From a paper:
A key step in the assembly pathway of double-stranded DNA viruses, including bacteriophage and evolutionarily related herpesviruses, is the packaging of viral genomic DNA into the procapsid. During this process, the large terminase protein docks onto the portal protein, which is embedded in the capsid wall, and translocates DNA using free energy liberated from ATP hydrolysis. Cryo-EM reconstructions reveal modifications to a canonical capsid protein fold, resulting in capsids that are abnormally large for this virus class. Structural information on the portal protein, through which the genome is packaged, demonstrates that the capsid influences the portal’s conformation.
As the previously determined structure of this portal protein was for a construct lacking 20 N-terminal amino acids, we determined the structure for the portal protein with an intact N terminus. This structure was refined at 1.95-Å resolution. With three subunits in the asymmetric unit, the 12-subunit oligomer is generated by the crystallographic fourfold axis. The portal protein forms a canonical 12-subunit oligomer with an overall shape consistent with those of portal proteins of other viruses. We refer to its domains as Clip, Stem, Wing, and Crown. The subunit−subunit interactions of this thermostable protein are enhanced compared with portal proteins of mesophilic bacteriophages SPP1 and T4 (34, 35). There are 39 hydrogen bonds (6.6 per 1,000 Å2) and seven salt bridges, compared with 26 hydrogen bonds (4.2 per 1,000 Å2) and five salt bridges observed in the SPP1 portal protein, and 22 hydrogen bonds (2.9 per 1,000 Å2) and four salt bridges present in the T4 portal protein. Of the first nine residues of the N terminus, five are positively charged, and thus may mediate electrostatic interactions with the capsid. To investigate conformational states accessible to the portal protein, we performed normal mode calculations with the crystal structure.
Numbering used by the authors:
A (entry chain C): 336 to 435
B (entry chain A): 26 to 437
C (entry chain B): 113 to 437
D (entry chain C): 26 to 223
Amino acid sequence: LTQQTIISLQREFASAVNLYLIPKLVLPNWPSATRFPRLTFEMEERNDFSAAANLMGMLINAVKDSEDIPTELKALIDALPSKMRRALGVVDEVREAVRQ
Amino acid sequence: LEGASVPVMSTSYDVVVDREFDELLQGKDGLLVYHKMLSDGTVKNALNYIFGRIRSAKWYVEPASTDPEDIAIAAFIHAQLGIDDASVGKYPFGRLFAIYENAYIYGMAAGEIVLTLGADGKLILDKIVPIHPFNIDEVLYDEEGGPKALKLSGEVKGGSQFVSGLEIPIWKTVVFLHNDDGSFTGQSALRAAVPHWLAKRALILLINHGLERFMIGVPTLTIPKSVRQGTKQWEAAKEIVKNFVQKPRHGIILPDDWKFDTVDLKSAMPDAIPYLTYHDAGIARALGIDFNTVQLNMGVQAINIGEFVSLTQQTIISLQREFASAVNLYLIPKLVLPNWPSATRFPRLTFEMEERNDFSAAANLMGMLINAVKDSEDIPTELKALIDALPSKMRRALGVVDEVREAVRQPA
Amino acid sequence: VGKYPFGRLFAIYENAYIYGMAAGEIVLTLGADGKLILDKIVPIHPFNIDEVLYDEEGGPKALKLSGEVKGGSQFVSGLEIPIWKTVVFLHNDDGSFTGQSALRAAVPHWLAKRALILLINHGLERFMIGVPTLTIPKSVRQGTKQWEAAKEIVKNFVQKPRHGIILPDDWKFDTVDLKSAMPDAIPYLTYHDAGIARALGIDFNTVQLNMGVQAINIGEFVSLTQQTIISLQREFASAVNLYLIPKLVLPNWPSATRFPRLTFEMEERNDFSAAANLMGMLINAVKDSEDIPTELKALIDALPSKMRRALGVVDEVREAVRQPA
Amino acid sequence: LEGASVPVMSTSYDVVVDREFDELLQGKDGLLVYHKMLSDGTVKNALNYIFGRIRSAKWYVEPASTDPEDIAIAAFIHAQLGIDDASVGKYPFGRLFAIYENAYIYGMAAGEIVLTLGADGKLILDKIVPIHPFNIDEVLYDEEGGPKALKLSGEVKGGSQFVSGLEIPIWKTVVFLHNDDGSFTGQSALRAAVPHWL
C-alpha cells in the first residue's frame, strides 16, 4: 500500500529529469532531435517472484532446442500478454547496445 | 429525424440548490473548506494512496477496431502520451492527472489544449494549461443547458496582471467533473468526510484540556475570613497555588488555619481514544476506502487484509473510468480530427482491471499454453492465435495482447 | 469504459437507486454508414419530474417535467415527453410501475446514529470537565464584589484550570458527583451506523472493516453480498434491453422480431485456480489438432454447464466485431 | 496552430495565498519550520525509508523508439548517468537525488547544468551545481505566468562574499517541485504532519 505513495515520488523525479535535463544533453549534439530518451524505473508493487521465476523456467524449456536461445527467448517474451511480460522484468535494449 | 426535446436542468428543489443544501459549502466558500482539509494528515494519507493507485493502473490505448487504419491512429495517440510500463510518459500525460486531482478535491477543474505543427507535418499536442477552480467564475450554458464556455478571473503567476471575466470556449478545453449526476455539476469527494473531520478536531481540543486537569490537578487553598485581597497574606496564597502548578518540587508550608487540596473529580479520566479514532478513521471510510487508515497494521484484525484492499479497488476503478471518459471525450478527438478530418470513430485511453491477485494460477496457465505450441515453427503467432480464442475469464487473467504497442515497436 | 453514453446510463440508474426512479431522453443521428445511431442520452433527474402520465389501462405513456434550464436562462413548466423517446429506470418495481429508494429501510438507523452522536458529545463534556458547584453563606448577596468572585471561580474552573481556586473558610467548592463511570455507548452507536449498510444488503461490517476479532473467511461474506449486487445488475440490464436496444434496432431493421440483450458475467465465488487447471487440461487434449482454436471452442460448448461457465464467456459477437474487413 | 489564450494563474482566493492559508508557514519563515522538523526522530526515520526506496527503484533509460538512432541517443544518456544494477552511477546522478530531497522537504529546489567538451567531440555533463531554497529570493515569470528565471541571494561557501539578486535563466537549470498543482508552486511533503508534530 505504501508503494503507491513512493512510486508517485519516483514519477515526479523522472518527469523533472525528462523535461529539464535530457533535452539539454541531446540537442547540442543532435540539433534536429524531435523526441528524447526518458529516465524510468521498475514498478515494485507486490512479491510475485516465485510464480514469475517458475514461468521464466517454462519459457527457457520451450526454446531449449533452439540454435540461438537468446534471440528466440527475447522474441517469445515480447509476444507475452502484458501482466506475464512485466512479471519477468525489463528486456533492456539500451543496456544491450552499451554492452556492445 | 429530431434532436433533443428535453433540456439539461439544474439539480434544484426547495433548499437544495445545484445539489447543495448546506450554505457553508455552497460556491467558492465551499472550496475554502476542502482546501483547509488538505492540511489534515488522514485526508493527505488517503489522497496519496488513491492518486498513487489511479496512476499505476497500466494505462494503454485500445483502437476503435482491428482495422489497420484504426491501429495507425491509435499508435499516433500512444506516441503523443508516451505510454510505457511505469505510466511515466511525456510531460503533458502527468499534467492531466494533476488537473483530475483538483477535480476530485474541489468537484471540477479544466485545462486548455494547445496544438503545434510536428516534424511529420501533423498537428500534435504542445501543452495543457491547467485551470484551477479558485480561478473559475462560472460555466456558461447554451439555451438547452449544454456547457459552451468557462469564465475565468484571477492573478497571472508572478503578479504581472489580473485576469477579469476571460471566456474560453469548451471545445478548446478538457473538463474533469467528479461524480457528475447528469446536470454537468461536479461534487468534491471530501463532501461526506466534513462531519467526521469537524468532530475529530473538536475531540482533540476536549482531550488536550481533560488531560491537563487529570495530569496536574486543580489546586484549592481555603484561608481564614480575615485574609483580604491586597495583603501580604493574599500574595502568599496566590504564590502557593501558582507554585503547585509550576514548581511541584517546591513544597507547601501552611499555618494550621490554611487548608490545601486538589478538586476531587470523583472518577478516572474517560478513555476518549476509541471515539476519536472512530471519527478520524471515518474520514477515509467516507472516501470509499475499506481498510482502517489510522490503526493500519496494529491490533487484533481480520486474517485476510488482501480482501479489504480488493473491496477498495471498486472505488478506485470508478475514478479511473471517470478520468478515461474525459480524455476520450474532450482530448483524443481534438488530436485526431485535425490530421484525419473524415474520422468517425476514435481510439480510447483505458487501463488493466486490478481486482484480485490471481497471478500464480494465471502464470501456471501461461506455462501450459507455451508447452502446447512449443514444437510450432512460429510460437509467437500460434500463441497469440490460441490466447484470443480463450474464454473471457482465462484470456483476461494473462493480461493485454497490445496490438497498438506492437505497431509502435515496428522498427522503420 | 465504453463510449461516452454507456457511462451516462449507469449515472441515471444510480439516481433511480437513490430516489426510486430516473430517466433519459434517447437522441439518434445519421451515421456515416447510412444507419441511425445513438447521438446522446439527456439525463432526467427526479427533482425535475412532476409525474408519469398513464393510459386507461394503467400503462405509462409520458413524463411531465418542470425545472430550471442549467445556467438559469428560463423555467420549464409541464413539458411532456412520450415514453417511447425515453429509457426509464425503476428500483424494486413491485408490478405497479412505482420505484422505491434503496435507502428507505436505512432511514431509522441513520436518524438513530445522528441522535446518538449528539448524546455522546454532551455526556463526554460533563464526564471530561465536571460541572462546578460553589456553596456560599446566606449573607453573600448578588450585585456585590463577593458575588462576582463566585461567578469568576466557576467560570475559571471550566476555562482556566491552571488558575487555581482561593476560598474563605465558609465557602465550599465541588464538582457534581455523577455516581458512576460514563456509560460506553460506542457499541450501540456502531450497531446503528453499521446497520445503515446492512439495510442496503451488504453482508460485511462497513464501519469496523478489517479491525477486531472476526470470522477467518471474509471472502464468504463478500460472496453473500454478491447476491444483492447481481440483482441490481439484472434491473439495469432489463431497462436497457426493454427501452434502449429496440429503439436502436427497429429504425435500421423495421421487420426485426428478436433483439440482442445486454448481460454480464456472474461473479459469485473464486473458482479460478481449479478453472485455470481445467483450461490447461482442455488445451493439452486438442494440442496435436491442425486447428486448435476451432476444436477447442467445439470441445468447450460440449462441456456440462458448471464446467463450461467456470472458464468464462466464448463471445461470438466480440469475434464478429474483431473480423478485419 | 494557435497559441494559448489562458495564462498560468496563482492558486489564490480570499485567505488562501499561493496554496497557503496559515501565515506562520508562508514564505521563508515556513522553510524554518520544515528545517526544524528534520531534528525529529520520527520525521528522519520516515525520510530515511522513503528516500532509500526511491533510489533503489532499478533506474534505467527507455528510448523514444526501437529505431537504431533512438537506441544510440538513449545509450549516450545511459553512459552519462552511469546506470548500473545498484543505482550507484557517476557523481552527478547522486547529486540530482539530493536536490530532489530538498524539494520534498521545502517544496522546491534546483541545480545549474554545466556542460564541457568530451574526448569524442561531444558536449557532455560536467556537473550539477545545487541551489537550496534558503538561497532563492523568487522565481521570475513571463507575461503568461511561465517561469523564465531564478533570483538568488546567499553567502558563497567559505564566506568570501555575499551574492545579491543573481539571475539564472531557467534553460540553464533543472527545477524540482513537490506536488505541483498546475500553478508552478511546490508544497512541502511535511505540511500535513505539522499538527501531529506540535
